[PDB]
Amino acid sequence: SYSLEHXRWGKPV
Amino acid sequence: GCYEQLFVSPEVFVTLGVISLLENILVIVAIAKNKNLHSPMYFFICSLAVADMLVSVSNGSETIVITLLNSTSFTVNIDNVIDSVICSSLLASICSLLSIAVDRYFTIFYALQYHNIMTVKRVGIIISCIWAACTVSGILFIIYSDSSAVIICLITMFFTMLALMASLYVHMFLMARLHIKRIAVLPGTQGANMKGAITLTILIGVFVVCWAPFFLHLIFYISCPQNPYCVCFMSHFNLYLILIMCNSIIDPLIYALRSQELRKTFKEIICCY
Amino acid sequence: ELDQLRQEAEQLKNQIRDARKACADATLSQITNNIDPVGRIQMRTRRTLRGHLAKIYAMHWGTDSRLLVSASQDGKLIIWDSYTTNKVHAIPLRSSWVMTCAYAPSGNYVACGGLDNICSIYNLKTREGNVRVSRELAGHTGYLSCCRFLDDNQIVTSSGDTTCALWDIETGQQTTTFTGHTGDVMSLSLAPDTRLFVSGACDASAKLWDVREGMCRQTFTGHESDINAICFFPNGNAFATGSDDATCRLFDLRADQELMTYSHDNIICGITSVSFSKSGRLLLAGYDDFNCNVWDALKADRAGVLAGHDNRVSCLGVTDDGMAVATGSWDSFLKIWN
Amino acid sequence: QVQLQESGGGLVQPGGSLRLSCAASGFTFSNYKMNWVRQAPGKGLEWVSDISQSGASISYTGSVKGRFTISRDNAKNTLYLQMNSLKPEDTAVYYCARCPAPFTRDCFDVTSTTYAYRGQGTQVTV
Amino acid sequence: TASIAQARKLVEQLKMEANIDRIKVSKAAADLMAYCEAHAKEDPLLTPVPASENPFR
Amino acid sequence: DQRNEEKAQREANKKIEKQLQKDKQVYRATHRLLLLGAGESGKNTIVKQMSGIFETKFQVDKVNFHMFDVGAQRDERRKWIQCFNDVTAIIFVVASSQTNRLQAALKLFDSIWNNKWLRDTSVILFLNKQDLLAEKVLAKIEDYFPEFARYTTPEDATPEPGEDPRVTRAKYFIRDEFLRISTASGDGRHYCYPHFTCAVDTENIRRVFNDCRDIIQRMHLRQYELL
Ligand SMILES: [Ca+2]
């Protein structure tokens, strides 16, 4: 489920 | 297309990473190989070049790792390590720019005492303390990344150091203008007023343009996450990272490349390699 | 009477000029045209010596071709080991305005001085192991421009008061005064047999002095401005001088005439230092363009250059054996070439 | 060897004029700045005129402006001085002097002590 | 005319320099050339001396 | 067995390099000044109110200054002038007012300023003996400097109360004569800081301090493309 994305705080949760 | 997240070709990240890597490495080599370039100011420029190299490398690495994994447990540890490296390196870059400017303010306003203050021992202590604090803060800010305290502390540190940098350069500009006014009033007599204004424009404008959108993103990430317009603004995270890496590629040209000795050393190194 | 004495002096000058013309059957350039050129000389820096902070004014090789003494404007002499680049001594000076230094042929003493008009002689070999001042020589009223060592008990100095002198080191008294120059004396050179020496001065002239008699034996003219460097030929029958007119000239002590001119259209800077190689075939000179040109001493062609300085070159010297050339400049670095 | 030999001196009545000369030898004349200096019978040497290598820029002491002029001829190696409307105050020995180095604009040539590039001088009695 | 004291010394020095048995230039030039040729093979700055002998590297 | 000698040499460097580092710090924190002046200059007073060379040291507000006064050297300056080409500043003291001593001073300043080795050295210029100039003028300049006849007081002149306008004009005329030379030849690499001082004045000690500060500040401002 968990994925890796550029940088951090890409999408608000 | 604001709702969809903006996708930036990995190639762009790997290109900016390699080019800025090359330039930062050249800047570090030119300083290490020229014994004349051993004043505190060049140690601070070296620290900046190192932080920029770290930003370009790790981020680039993250891009390659993501691309390779997508073309094909470990993911969590890899993501946590790379992100702690990126956060630490960004903090080091900001602190290095503040040190450079802070160093300069000292010379202009402590011309006679300057050498009894910025002794090489103290420069080494300051740089090591800055790097240790930036590394520790990057680690804590990634381990607890799912907390408002970390984003709040990141925007506070950015805007405090932006205000400090702008204040220091404005004060130095005002002193230069006072000297211009006294120099011009002589019986025997762009312009200095334009050269100074352009220098401030480039030095502050590049910093603000290449950094601030990311911290505006974080501001919206706390303030208005679900707002229809802030979501559209946040869709450009992948562009704000490019602007930050573009500061890693640009900054050597407005500090390291203004000195004549570093230029001479660059040109000799370039022709050798 | 003054006008008649002046006329007599002019008559003697004309007689000397005609006496010299009578011997001018051919120039050097008409003889060495049948000698193959040395070709291109490409020296490379082997070692760099660091430690001085201020511009370096003087350097001198010892007789073992292994140690160097150098003096900067900080007020410090450094003894270096050219082989291992390690330092041996770092002697603080009473005053920082040092213009010349010399290494004794025995390796026992180091002399230096400058604007204080005092020649300080340091004993490098003491029972305590500490470097101490053994003598301070004073009498000169102008700045001290050059010092040379004849023996452990005899030193030759020159100063900005237009007078050269021979000093007895142990007694501390001046024993011989060499007068006749009207401008500052810039550089001294000793004969291989240390019986004669030559003194260049800010008169566009040089004089051949008899060390033992106190008499000036010959006066050489030819330069258009102040003479900055002088150096005896290895044989001992000629010397080379450099001046502010950007020309270097070779003079012959046996014909009392100028023998060769070394110049180039693109050189408009003076010659800070002049030195010869062991065979006398190469002439090296430092300029104000932050470089050094190597000239073919028998042809007046340029053989090559030594580039690696970013400020005025201040001194140049060659080892007694001939294995290396060392230079110093206002960049506070010394470099050795090969 | 370099020489400077002054000429064109003499004695004149107040209000008269002289044309002085100076022949140079032993150096390239066109590469040096040239000056005129005077020795007062009871005063130390004083600078009078300074002409650049090209003749494009000429400086005079304030006391001689509008009365004295200088020129040079690089094809003849000759330096002149036109001395007009002379007064008793201009009695002095005049010397022609050369700047110590070529291709420069800094000169130290009025030294009390024997200067190497100075001529013998000519007496201008008024 | 006090300065005659210095002029006289100049005259005496010129007389001493006038009485010099000057050598012909072509002979001295030939001697310097012969000297240079005799020791040309011995001069480390002209001769491409091997690196194994050169103590500086 | 030769390694014992090599080890010994390494130890010597360690002792020497550490001392050089200590000495290097002392060197960079010390401000060197060259003091020159006219034969009639009150150079002695310049020293009192603050062999071939004399040295005076000062500590002004915890800043170490080292002033060198040229001793019994020959009047030919063209060779030792080159040595003082890295001092913080040259202090040139000229007395206002028998030869035309002012023209000699102006002649000397022009030669110094345009020296190929002194292009980056600033000059602090002290005009001394103001009361002798004032008395001579009020009791002549046009006979030496004819253009004075057409000189007017600068609009930014700030004379002290009680000064005779003819004296203030003479002071600014002389100052401007030096400044025209400085301005015409200078290319922003060095500046002249002329001052009008009294033969006896202890304030001169702070005038040098403040000028040295400004010289360094503008040097760095030049470096950082701000000035
Ligand atoms: Ca991540």
Short mmCIF file of N, CA, C and O in Angstrom, two decimals, chain B residues 87-102 130 133-134 137 141 152-169 203-204 207-208 211 215 255:
data_model
loop_
_atom_site.label_atom_id
_atom_site.label_comp_id
_atom_site.label_asym_id
_atom_site.label_seq_id
_atom_site.Cartn_x
_atom_site.Cartn_y
_atom_site.Cartn_z
N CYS B 87 16.46 16.32 3.71
CA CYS B 87 16.10 17.36 4.67
C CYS B 87 17.33 17.96 5.34
O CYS B 87 17.46 19.19 5.45
N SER B 88 18.27 17.10 5.77
CA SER B 88 19.48 17.60 6.39
C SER B 88 20.27 18.48 5.43
O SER B 88 20.77 19.55 5.81
N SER B 89 20.39 18.05 4.18
CA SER B 89 21.16 18.81 3.20
C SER B 89 20.50 20.16 2.89
O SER B 89 21.20 21.16 2.70
N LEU B 90 19.16 20.21 2.84
CA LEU B 90 18.49 21.49 2.59
C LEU B 90 18.72 22.45 3.74
O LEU B 90 18.97 23.65 3.54
N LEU B 91 18.66 21.93 4.97
CA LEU B 91 18.91 22.79 6.12
C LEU B 91 20.35 23.30 6.09
O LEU B 91 20.61 24.47 6.40
N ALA B 92 21.28 22.44 5.69
CA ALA B 92 22.68 22.86 5.59
C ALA B 92 22.86 23.93 4.53
O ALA B 92 23.65 24.86 4.71
N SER B 93 22.16 23.82 3.40
CA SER B 93 22.27 24.83 2.35
C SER B 93 21.79 26.19 2.84
O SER B 93 22.45 27.22 2.64
N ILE B 94 20.64 26.21 3.53
CA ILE B 94 20.11 27.48 4.02
C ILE B 94 21.05 28.07 5.06
O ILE B 94 21.36 29.28 5.04
N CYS B 95 21.54 27.23 5.98
CA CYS B 95 22.45 27.72 7.01
C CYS B 95 23.75 28.23 6.41
O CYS B 95 24.33 29.20 6.91
N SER B 96 24.23 27.59 5.34
CA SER B 96 25.45 28.04 4.69
C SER B 96 25.27 29.41 4.05
O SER B 96 26.16 30.26 4.15
N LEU B 97 24.12 29.65 3.42
CA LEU B 97 23.89 30.99 2.86
C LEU B 97 23.82 32.03 3.96
O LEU B 97 24.35 33.15 3.82
N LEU B 98 23.21 31.67 5.09
CA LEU B 98 23.16 32.62 6.20
C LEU B 98 24.56 32.90 6.73
O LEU B 98 24.88 34.04 7.07
N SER B 99 25.39 31.86 6.84
CA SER B 99 26.76 32.05 7.32
C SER B 99 27.56 32.95 6.40
O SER B 99 28.37 33.76 6.86
N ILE B 100 27.44 32.74 5.09
CA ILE B 100 28.17 33.54 4.13
C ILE B 100 27.83 35.00 4.33
O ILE B 100 28.70 35.84 4.52
N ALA B 101 26.54 35.30 4.31
CA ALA B 101 26.08 36.66 4.49
C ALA B 101 26.48 37.17 5.86
O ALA B 101 26.91 38.30 5.99
N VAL B 102 26.35 36.34 6.89
CA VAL B 102 26.72 36.75 8.24
C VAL B 102 28.21 37.05 8.34
O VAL B 102 28.63 37.95 9.06
N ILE B 130 27.23 23.67 12.55
CA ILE B 130 26.11 23.85 11.63
C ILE B 130 25.75 22.53 10.98
O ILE B 130 24.58 22.15 10.90
N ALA B 133 24.10 20.14 13.53
CA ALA B 133 22.72 20.52 13.85
C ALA B 133 21.80 20.26 12.67
O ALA B 133 20.66 19.81 12.86
N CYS B 134 22.26 20.52 11.45
CA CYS B 134 21.42 20.29 10.28
C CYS B 134 21.15 18.81 10.08
O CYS B 134 20.02 18.42 9.76
N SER B 137 18.67 17.72 12.88
CA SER B 137 17.33 18.23 12.62
C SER B 137 16.69 17.52 11.44
O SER B 137 15.49 17.26 11.46
N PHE B 141 13.25 15.57 11.77
CA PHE B 141 12.15 16.04 10.94
C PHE B 141 11.65 14.98 9.98
O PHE B 141 10.54 15.12 9.46
N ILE B 152 5.88 23.18 10.89
CA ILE B 152 5.92 24.51 11.50
C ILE B 152 7.36 24.94 11.76
O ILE B 152 7.74 26.08 11.47
N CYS B 153 8.19 24.03 12.27
CA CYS B 153 9.57 24.40 12.53
C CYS B 153 10.33 24.65 11.24
O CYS B 153 11.18 25.55 11.20
N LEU B 154 9.97 23.97 10.16
CA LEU B 154 10.66 24.21 8.90
C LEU B 154 10.31 25.58 8.32
O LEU B 154 11.21 26.31 7.87
N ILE B 155 9.04 25.97 8.40
CA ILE B 155 8.70 27.28 7.85
C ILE B 155 9.24 28.39 8.75
O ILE B 155 9.66 29.44 8.25
N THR B 156 9.28 28.16 10.06
CA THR B 156 9.84 29.17 10.96
C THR B 156 11.32 29.38 10.67
O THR B 156 11.78 30.52 10.56
N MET B 157 12.08 28.29 10.54
CA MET B 157 13.50 28.44 10.26
C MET B 157 13.73 29.12 8.92
O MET B 157 14.58 30.02 8.81
N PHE B 158 12.95 28.75 7.89
CA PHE B 158 13.15 29.39 6.60
C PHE B 158 12.90 30.89 6.71
O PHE B 158 13.69 31.69 6.18
N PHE B 159 11.81 31.30 7.36
CA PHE B 159 11.44 32.70 7.20
C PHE B 159 12.27 33.56 8.13
O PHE B 159 12.58 34.71 7.80
N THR B 160 12.75 32.98 9.23
CA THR B 160 13.69 33.68 10.09
C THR B 160 15.00 33.91 9.35
O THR B 160 15.57 35.01 9.39
N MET B 161 15.48 32.90 8.62
CA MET B 161 16.76 33.08 7.96
C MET B 161 16.64 33.95 6.71
O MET B 161 17.58 34.67 6.37
N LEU B 162 15.47 33.95 6.07
CA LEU B 162 15.24 34.88 4.97
C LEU B 162 15.25 36.32 5.47
O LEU B 162 15.87 37.20 4.86
N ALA B 163 14.54 36.58 6.57
CA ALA B 163 14.53 37.93 7.12
C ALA B 163 15.93 38.36 7.53
O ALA B 163 16.32 39.51 7.28
N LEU B 164 16.71 37.45 8.11
CA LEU B 164 18.06 37.82 8.53
C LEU B 164 18.95 38.12 7.33
O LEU B 164 19.69 39.11 7.33
N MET B 165 18.86 37.31 6.27
CA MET B 165 19.69 37.53 5.10
C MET B 165 19.35 38.86 4.44
O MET B 165 20.24 39.65 4.09
N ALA B 166 18.05 39.13 4.27
CA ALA B 166 17.64 40.37 3.63
C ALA B 166 18.05 41.58 4.47
O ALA B 166 18.52 42.58 3.92
N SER B 167 17.93 41.48 5.79
CA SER B 167 18.32 42.60 6.64
C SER B 167 19.81 42.88 6.53
O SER B 167 20.23 44.04 6.41
N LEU B 168 20.63 41.82 6.55
CA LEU B 168 22.08 42.01 6.51
C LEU B 168 22.51 42.63 5.19
O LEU B 168 23.31 43.58 5.16
N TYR B 169 21.93 42.17 4.07
CA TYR B 169 22.34 42.72 2.79
C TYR B 169 21.81 44.13 2.60
O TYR B 169 22.50 44.96 1.99
N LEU B 203 20.99 38.71 -5.52
CA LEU B 203 21.25 37.91 -4.33
C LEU B 203 19.97 37.56 -3.58
O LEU B 203 19.81 36.42 -3.12
N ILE B 204 19.06 38.51 -3.43
CA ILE B 204 17.83 38.22 -2.70
C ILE B 204 16.79 37.56 -3.60
O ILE B 204 16.09 36.63 -3.17
N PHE B 207 17.38 33.78 -4.15
CA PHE B 207 17.07 33.01 -2.95
C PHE B 207 15.57 32.86 -2.78
O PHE B 207 15.05 31.74 -2.63
N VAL B 208 14.83 33.97 -2.88
CA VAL B 208 13.39 33.93 -2.66
C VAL B 208 12.68 33.14 -3.76
O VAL B 208 11.85 32.28 -3.47
N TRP B 211 13.64 29.28 -3.47
CA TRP B 211 13.22 28.57 -2.27
C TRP B 211 11.73 28.71 -2.00
O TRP B 211 11.03 27.70 -1.87
N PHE B 215 8.22 26.42 0.64
CA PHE B 215 7.73 26.69 1.98
C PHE B 215 6.31 27.23 1.93
O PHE B 215 5.55 27.06 2.89
N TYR B 255 28.41 33.56 -5.98
CA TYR B 255 29.32 33.65 -4.84
C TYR B 255 30.71 33.21 -5.27
O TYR B 255 31.65 34.01 -5.27
#
